[PDB]
Design an enzyme around this catalytic site. Structure first.
Site, mmCIF file in Angstrom:
data_model
loop_
_atom_site.group_PDB
_atom_site.id
_atom_site.type_symbol
_atom_site.label_atom_id
_atom_site.label_comp_id
_atom_site.label_asym_id
_atom_site.label_seq_id
_atom_site.Cartn_x
_atom_site.Cartn_y
_atom_site.Cartn_z
ATOM 1 N N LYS A 1 -0.324 -0.652 -4.499
ATOM 2 C CA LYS A 1 -1.723 -0.332 -4.357
ATOM 3 C C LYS A 1 -1.870 1.118 -3.959
ATOM 4 C CE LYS A 1 -5.941 -1.408 -1.784
ATOM 5 N NZ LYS A 1 -6.191 -0.297 -0.820
ATOM 6 N N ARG B 1 -10.852 7.181 1.240
ATOM 7 C CA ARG B 1 -10.438 7.286 2.675
ATOM 8 C C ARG B 1 -9.115 7.979 2.916
ATOM 9 N NH1 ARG B 1 -13.498 3.678 5.816
ATOM 10 N NH2 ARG B 1 -11.834 3.092 7.265
ATOM 11 N N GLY C 1 -12.538 0.571 -5.855
ATOM 12 C CA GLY C 1 -13.337 1.697 -5.491
ATOM 13 C C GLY C 1 -14.732 1.645 -6.036
ATOM 14 N N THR D 1 0.873 -1.171 0.000
ATOM 15 C CA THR D 1 0.000 0.000 0.000
ATOM 16 C C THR D 1 0.904 1.212 0.000
ATOM 17 O OG1 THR D 1 -1.738 -1.214 1.029
ATOM 18 C CG2 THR D 1 -1.870 1.225 1.088
ATOM 19 N N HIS E 1 -8.121 4.532 -2.551
ATOM 20 C CA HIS E 1 -8.246 3.935 -1.194
ATOM 21 C C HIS E 1 -9.679 4.064 -0.727
ATOM 22 C CE1 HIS E 1 -5.457 2.514 2.219
ATOM 23 N NE2 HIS E 1 -6.600 2.621 2.862
HETATM 24 C C1 LIG Z 1 -12.687 -0.324 6.847
HETATM 25 C C2 LIG Z 1 -11.639 -0.262 5.750
HETATM 26 C C3 LIG Z 1 -10.349 -0.635 6.045
HETATM 27 C C4 LIG Z 1 -9.331 -0.663 5.131
HETATM 28 N N1 LIG Z 1 -8.090 -1.068 5.415
HETATM 29 C C5 LIG Z 1 -7.108 -1.079 4.455
HETATM 30 C C6 LIG Z 1 -5.780 -1.541 4.710
HETATM 31 O O1 LIG Z 1 -5.478 -1.986 5.904
HETATM 32 N N2 LIG Z 1 -4.888 -1.603 3.720
HETATM 33 C C7 LIG Z 1 -5.199 -1.125 2.426
HETATM 34 O O2 LIG Z 1 -4.279 -1.114 1.612
HETATM 35 N N3 LIG Z 1 -6.391 -0.694 2.167
HETATM 36 C C8 LIG Z 1 -7.396 -0.652 3.048
HETATM 37 N N4 LIG Z 1 -8.642 -0.247 2.766
HETATM 38 C C9 LIG Z 1 -9.001 0.152 1.367
HETATM 39 C C10 LIG Z 1 -9.470 -1.050 0.536
HETATM 40 O O3 LIG Z 1 -8.404 -1.982 0.342
HETATM 41 C C11 LIG Z 1 -10.017 -0.620 -0.844
HETATM 42 O O4 LIG Z 1 -9.007 0.177 -1.493
HETATM 43 C C12 LIG Z 1 -11.291 0.137 -0.745
HETATM 44 O O5 LIG Z 1 -12.157 -0.371 0.333
HETATM 45 C C13 LIG Z 1 -11.932 -0.244 -2.103
HETATM 46 O O6 LIG Z 1 -13.080 0.265 -2.174
HETATM 47 P P1 LIG Z 1 -14.534 -0.407 -1.911
HETATM 48 O O7 LIG Z 1 -14.577 -0.500 -0.385
HETATM 49 O O8 LIG Z 1 -15.378 0.680 -2.371
HETATM 50 O O9 LIG Z 1 -14.722 -1.700 -2.670
HETATM 51 C C14 LIG Z 1 -9.699 -0.278 3.723
HETATM 52 C C15 LIG Z 1 -10.975 0.044 3.450
HETATM 53 C C16 LIG Z 1 -12.021 0.085 4.417
HETATM 54 C C17 LIG Z 1 -13.432 0.456 4.026
HETATM 55 C C1 LIG Z 2 -5.814 1.733 5.322
HETATM 56 C C2 LIG Z 2 -6.994 1.598 6.288
HETATM 57 C C3 LIG Z 2 -8.138 2.565 5.994
HETATM 58 O O1 LIG Z 2 -9.087 2.632 6.829
HETATM 59 O O2 LIG Z 2 -8.058 3.230 4.974
HETATM 60 C C4 LIG Z 2 -6.689 1.698 7.665
HETATM 61 C C5 LIG Z 2 -7.698 1.347 8.586
HETATM 62 C C6 LIG Z 2 -7.523 1.389 9.966
HETATM 63 C C7 LIG Z 2 -6.311 1.801 10.453
HETATM 64 C C8 LIG Z 2 -5.306 2.149 9.540
HETATM 65 C C9 LIG Z 2 -5.469 2.111 8.151
#
Ligand SMILES: Cc1cc2nc3c(=O)[nH]c(=O)nc-3n(C[C@H](O)[C@H](O)[C@H](O)COP(=O)(O)O)c2cc1C
Ligand SMILES: C[C@H](C(=O)O)c1ccccc1
Ligand SMILES: Cc1cc2nc3c(=O)[nH]c(=O)nc-3n(C[C@H](O)[C@H](O)[C@H](O)COP(=O)(O)O)c2cc1C
Ligand SMILES: Cc1cc2nc3c(=O)[nH]c(=O)nc-3n(C[C@H](O)[C@H](O)[C@H](O)COP(=O)(O)O)c2cc1C
Ligand SMILES: Cc1cc2nc3c(=O)[nH]c(=O)nc-3n(C[C@H](O)[C@H](O)[C@H](O)COP(=O)(O)O)c2cc1C
Ligand SMILES: C[C@H](C(=O)O)c1ccccc1
Ligand SMILES: C[C@H](C(=O)O)c1ccccc1
Ligand SMILES: C[C@H](C(=O)O)c1ccccc1
Ligand SMILES: C[C@H](C(=O)O)c1ccccc1
Ligand SMILES: C[C@H](C(=O)O)c1ccccc1
Ligand SMILES: C[C@H](C(=O)O)c1ccccc1
Ligand SMILES: C[C@H](C(=O)O)c1ccccc1
EC number: 1.1.3.46
Lengths: 327, 327, 327, 327
Positions: free
Chosen positions: D200, D227, D256, D149, D224
């Site tokens: 990513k 987020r 996404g 990431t 992401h």
């Molecule tokens: C609750 C939550 C936690 C996430 N944690 C991570 C993470 O630890 N590492 C990461 O690379 N992406 C993280 N993401 C992003 C997802 O991998 C992804 O890019 C995003 O959720 C894709 O979109 P979608 O949720 O609309 O399908 C997270 C997303 C959400 C909603």
């Molecule tokens: C990448 C991911 C996120 O939420 O975007 C994340 C969730 C909880 C804590 C750190 C990072």
């Protein structure tokens, strides 16, 4: 007209009104059919001779009163007890071609006996011989064109119908009684009939060109009223490109969302030979049977003539030469 | 101004307020007139001399106080008992041309006697001789231009009016007492008057060019306030293209949706010589008669001067040289 | 931040909240300032060194902590009793330039005595000598730039204020105590000061170029927060074109609708040297006085650093090299 | 599917549902992910052989049943007590790769022991040695790819979470137990593993090209899930440009907003090798644990096959050659 839609909602059972109104998926393609037409604006011409405005066209060998035909809609007894016979009668009397469906709830020979200008819509059967039988039946009954539906290798996922657990009432059947069609299927049909073969459900430009190359007499540029692939482009958004690509090699029809004479005018101005109209015809059938469909076709006829003349067009040919602007 | 619209809704009978507000069909062209103006943004200039800002123009031989005229609106006694005389008086006093209608509810000679700068709007009669009589009457009465309406081969389908079963009160009549006009009709008018002939309802570029070729002194780029073809492009969307095509060969006016001095400025910046204003004038007449129309014209005059100076323009000519961006 | 807006609505009298929030006309330009920013998307860069991210810039000879200054907003005692002194103190402590207004409700010398990096906004007086006096006063007091407002030949028509019959409370006055400015006025100011002259309210590309030619040290690309010409393009929609045209010949600032650090990032990526922020600073002043403004500036500082680093920019220069996509 | 979202809202505590649903800032990028997909329309092909439609792909050395993997989502015990093991089991059984997170609430070795096709998502630690330890652990456990990431130099500002004062329940921990990553970090990972490294969070074209140059085996074009930077372009809006730039030099994934098989088809048609799906998988986990995720993956599998065949594609390769139109 929108008056008829409400009338039909009142009379029909909810689940049947949904079988009729619905699209596949999120209904994105269903909504986009309307959006697409709404964004098209016509540039009208003024001060032309309108002494003899005519809405008539010649298509597939015959005169039609309007640049419009009734689209194939399966199982029309779902909407009124006279089903396909009510609609076919109204179409005949209006001088509009009527498309008899493979999945008609009255037999194709009965509907053809009504008279008028019947076309026949084909779904390809697993079994080249039965498919070709249906075609031969239609031809023997006096149908004037074969509308080969090419966008249904199988049915789309209609979430309304799945949610309702919708099923055919046992009082509606396929009175004429499936596999994905290919270009080889088209050729088999073309080789077995002298009628024009019209491929319904073309959206890609290269498929329109290949349809001409394949010996089609027409195509219908269509996303199946938003009922097949959800996310398929509206036919009206492909039409101008398609008309240019075929460069007069076959008739190019369009459908999806046509709800007024002004919409017909837009389609014509984008280059369509004619349109199909589906859902509105069924609203009129549901609301008032044969006379309902007759009233709808007379209103459309009035609206088409009105729009044409307001736009300075004494003929459909002239309407095709109108320019448009996207808004 | 929008204050006046509510005031007029309060006072007028519903069916008359609808005859006034409505468009044809689904009102797509009516709404688009507003949308089109709302998407136009002006690029103002700064730091120019504004010691003598003037909103005056010369048009059709005469000075006007603003780049604006009152559009032709039939049967103004529908809105107030003094009808056309109230509006014409207010226009005179504001230095704004007033367009007398063929379907005026007070005779054209009476309205012309008010003074000011009256123009006369022509509808072509079945009977070249009566048409040319109306023209001669207008000219004998001191009208300064003939505004030939060319977008009404017949009336549009106004669904509000059909729904209301709207009809003229027997206390309103056509005090001056039809067939589609052609280019031959234009020539007959041009040959029979020395007044400038202004063709109202042009939207196609080639029709604007042919209007010049035909000897028109002006055109009004217009979709008839969304009351004729539903789906006709707004005039404001064609104006820049049209102004370029005529390349100073005639005056190019625009109408449809002008609701403020800022809207006037937008039209000018797109290349309009002047605008027409329809519905707002009638709202003011309905609300407060002559003094209502006077107050509207003074507010518009204030708003036009304000907008011009804010945009660095000491004259309407300068406003025409402003650039715009579509948003 | 939007939290502060609600807090300010609660505390302020309605008519004062309207003097602050309102635009001219239909508020089309006010809304468009927001729309314009919302349609801009940044293309962030990844995997760059962020060990020492800095939001500092140099502008008009001095370091600023952020690429942002407090916009000129007249009569700040309307919002809180400490008025301009509360805001100037918070700005100083945040390392943000503060623009002292010609129509300040505390004298320019008092506000300058606060310290920090004060700029002075000029309105041109009828009387070149008094105008030049104000400039000399500002310079003698230690102001570092003259922000000449060039978009107010007179005030815009603020319909909220007219509707409220809004007037200055007798407890607010113009503590420093008008005519349209021209390019000759700019030259008179330039010839009478060694401070950079910054022209505020430029939207046309040719006016940005002429500003450079005129010896301006900067411009602020601005539609005056939608308070001057209604229908004026947003500054953010002109900024990229303007930055290209001046090609480093002066600093190019922007304002209108900046409501977050992400918005600052968008403006930077479009080529702005820095932004001005108006209404949000006043919301914070209304809500919590000096400490309110301090909290706002700290939140903005946090948001700018956050956005920069998320976008792979260790400096504002790098942010200017970001690309964008319009959505 | 949207049914699952409501079910998850019902069962989860509000603050946890918000940690899941939320984006950074004003959620502009979160909403834009959906908008972007909704504006893409597919141009389906007709009359192709569909005798053996397959949704399988080969990626990173192995067959996958669909062109889809479960996105990395930290702390899945927040949503259901079986957390990552429930999801990984369902993914295995569906033939879908599962991405194990650095911030997993069950240890990476436990989740890998489930079997299937596990990938491992890396966050760079302050300490090149610990980072490289995590990588080695993942590789020793049988993970098949490292998903580095690269869009989180630090976390985005999630206003929902700040408003809730959201914190990890003490019953959820980082079972595997930070600094900004750079291109040097990528190289250190690449030099220490034989597994494909997949970056990513790439959005700029030049970063996609540099990823190839850096020896990445793939990228995930991603903001992401809205987020990280608020105002970052959606990955789907960059994808076609990125696919063209890399010209087959690495796999190009996207994420996404993917919420249906039709969305998968759109991404494929824009050139994606495969997609990631995040939030929907968590809705299914929250609603019904392992069997919830299994049902979601079966529905997606059905929808992907349906859409492909409706669009005339017997393979994902063919889907990549589909054209699109933006609406
Ligand atoms: C609750 C939550 C936690 C996430 N944690 C991570 C993470 O630890 N590492 C990461 O690379 N992406 C993280 N993401 C992003 C997802 O991998 C992804 O890019 C995003 O959720 C894709 O979109 P979608 O949720 O609309 O399908 C997270 C997303 C959400 C909603
Ligand atoms: C990448 C991911 C996120 O939420 O975007 C994340 C969730 C909880 C804590 C750190 C990072
Ligand atoms: C209830 C229903 C049934 C349909 N049945 C068929 C069919 O049997 N064959 C076919 O080719 N198209 C069928 N269609 C699609 C129509 O022929 C036409 O493409 C679509 O309705 C046109 O759009 P409109 O309804 O918006 O006018 C059907 C449409 C509806 C609404
Ligand atoms: C009630 C009504 C009556 C009209 N009558 C005429 C007419 O007799 N002749 C004509 O050329 N245009 C007529 N018009 C159109 C106007 O001249 C003008 O084109 C239109 O109102 C301009 O738009 P606006 O109303 O949005 O300002 C009429 C418009 C309205 C609303
Ligand atoms: C209440 C108010 C008063 C203002 N007074 C002035 C002024 O005296 N001089 C000036 O040049 N601009 C003035 N402006 C405009 C601002 O400097 C700035 O251009 C505008 O507020 C920027 O937009 P924003 O408020 O959306 O951040 C004022 C703005 C507001 C809202
Ligand atoms: C083609 C048509 C449709 O609904 O799209 C159809 C209706 C009922 C059953 C099969 C096909
Ligand atoms: C603004 C207007 C509309 O979309 O309503 C428009 C019509 C035709 C072409 C461009 C814009
Ligand atoms: C042209 C005008 C109109 O309403 O558009 C008109 C009004 C009443 C009757 C005829 C024509
Ligand atoms: C975003 C803004 C708008 O349409 O409000 C805009 C104004 C002029 C040109 C482009 C966009
Ligand atoms: C420039 C500024 C404004 O409101 O735009 C102003 C406020 C009060 C009085 C005069 C000018
Ligand atoms: C569809 C999306 C949007 O406008 O939300 C978009 C972002 C950037 C560029 C184009 C479109
Ligand atoms: C009008 C329609 C839409 O956006 O719904 C459209 C689909 C594809 C391409 C252009 C427009």
């Amino acid at each position: 007209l929108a008056d008829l839609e409400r009338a039909a909602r009142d009379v029909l059972p909810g689940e049947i009104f949904d079988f009729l109104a619905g699209g596949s998926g999120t209904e994105a393609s269903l909504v986009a059919n309307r959006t697409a037409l709404e964004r098209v604006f016509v540039i009208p011409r003024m001060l032309r001779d309108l002494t003899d405005v005519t809405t008539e066209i010649d298509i597939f060998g015959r005169r039609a009163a309007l640049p419009m035909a009734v689209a194939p809609v399966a199982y029309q007894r779902l909407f009124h007890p006279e089903g396909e016979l009510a609609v076919a009668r109204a179409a005949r009397d209006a001088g509009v071609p009527y498309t008899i469906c493979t999945l008609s709830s009255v037999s194709l020979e009965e509907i053809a006996a009504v008279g008028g200008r019947p076309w026949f819509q084909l779904f390809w059967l697993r079994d080249e011989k039965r498919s070709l039988d249906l075609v031969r039946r239609a031809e023997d009954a006096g149908c004037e064109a074969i509308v080969f539906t090419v966008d249904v290798p199988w049915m789309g996922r209609r979430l309304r119908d799945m949610r309702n657990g919708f099923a055919l009432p046992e009082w509606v059947t396929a009175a004429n009684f499936f596999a994905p069609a290919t270009w080889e299927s088209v050729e088999a049909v073309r080789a077995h009939t002298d009628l024009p073969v019209v491929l319904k459900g073309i959206l890609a430009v290269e498929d329109a060109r290949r349809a001409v190359d394949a010996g089609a007499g027409g195509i219908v540029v269509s996303n199946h009223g938003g009922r097949q692939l959800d996310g398929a482009v509206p036919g009206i958004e492909m039409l101008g490109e398609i008309v240019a690509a075929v460069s007069g090699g076959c008739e190019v029809l369009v459908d999806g969302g046509i709800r007024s004479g002004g919409d017909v005018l837009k389609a014509t101005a984008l280059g369509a030979s004619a349109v199909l109209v589906g859902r509105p015809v069924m609203w009129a059938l549901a609301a008032a049977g044969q006379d309902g469909v007759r009233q709808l076709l007379e209103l459309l006829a009035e609206e088409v003539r009105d729009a044409m003349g307001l736009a300075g067009c004494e003929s459909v040919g002239a309407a095709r030469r109108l320019n448009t602007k996207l808004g």
